[PDB]
Amino acid sequence: GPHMTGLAAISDALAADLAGLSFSSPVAHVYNPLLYAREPHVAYLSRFGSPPKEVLFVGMNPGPWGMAQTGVPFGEVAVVTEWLGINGTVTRPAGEHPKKRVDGFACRRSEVSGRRLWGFIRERFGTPERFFARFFVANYCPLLFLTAEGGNITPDKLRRGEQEPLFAACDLALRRTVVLLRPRVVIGVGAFAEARCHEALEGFDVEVGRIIHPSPASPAANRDWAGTALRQLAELGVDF
């Protein structure tokens, strides 16, 4: 297959692979920020994703108020505009649901998860350049899935028949990402992402580990997400 010159090639190949897939009830709507938030997504890939990296963080899929708005993984609006310096054109997905509107950089909801993750990175590293010198953050699946009533559907809850071709496409993009960036360690943010990384990357010369996911759905994340993750990283051998 084609040579992957960079992350943007990889994301474009992924979007193409995704565009051929079908999803059905209870999926009613599928959002692909790789298409509607392409300019800010490619900004993030091009400004911060130059190879090599030592460590790759991998999330699961966009939150409605983060990457679905900005094109950036865990991409809370404020942190993407203020810290990363990215603020660009975001159009609305085909069939946008009214309970999950894509206002882009005008979105006024703050995503907790990405606020916590990027805020901790900002606190530990100061500038983006000190972080991205060694690290990167990507999602395994760039799509957001909703029911007809606008409810989120995580990719683990898709019917197997539709899940398998989705995961095949996402695994291929992940392997391509790892061959380009050459990290020593790939870290799933949460259990689902961790399990996909072990599945996709077996036999590569990389270690795979996990950190706690920053969402309020975990008690430890509310008490001390940063201290917890900082411990996990240290147990993995990762300097943060």
Ligand X SMILES: O=c1[nH]c(=O)c2nc[nH]c2[nH]1
Name the site residues for ligand X (rule: CB under 6 A).
59-63, 66-67, 73-74, 111, 113-114, 139, 189, 215
Query: Of the two residues 161 and 217, which places its CB atom closer to ligand X in the complex?
Result: 217
- Is 41 a known ligand-binding residue? no
Helix (H, G, I), strand (E, B), or coil: what is residue 144?
A: strand
Give the shortest CB-82-to-ligand X separation in angstroms. Answer: 18
CA 66, 41, 153, 60 dihedral sign is negative
Smallest separation (angstroms) from ligand X to the CB of 204 = 21
Q: 199: annotated binding-site residue?
A: no
Cβ closer to ligand X: 40 or 114? 114
From the list 192, 120, 141, the residue with the least C-alpha distance to 30 is 141
Phi-psi region of 77 (alpha: psi -120 to 50; beta: other; left: phi over 0): alpha
Two tokens, residue 19: 């565009």
The amino acid at 228: T
The annotation status of 60 as a binding-site residue, yes or no, is yes
139 carries a ligand binding annotation: yes
Ranked by CB distance to ligand X, the top (closest) residue is 59
Measure the CA–CA gap between 178 and 201, rounded to whole angstroms.
Answer: 8
111 is in an annotated binding site: yes
The smaller minimum CB distance to ligand X, of residues 156 and 235, is found at 156
Minimal distance in Å, beta carbon 193 to ligand X?
6
Q: How many angstroms separate the CA atoms of 96 and 199, rounded?
A: 32
CB of 31 to ligand X, least distance (A): 12
d(CA 228, CA 223): 9
Known binding-site residue numbers: 60-61, 74, 111, 139, 213
Known binding-site residue numbers for xanthine: 60-61, 74, 111, 139, 213
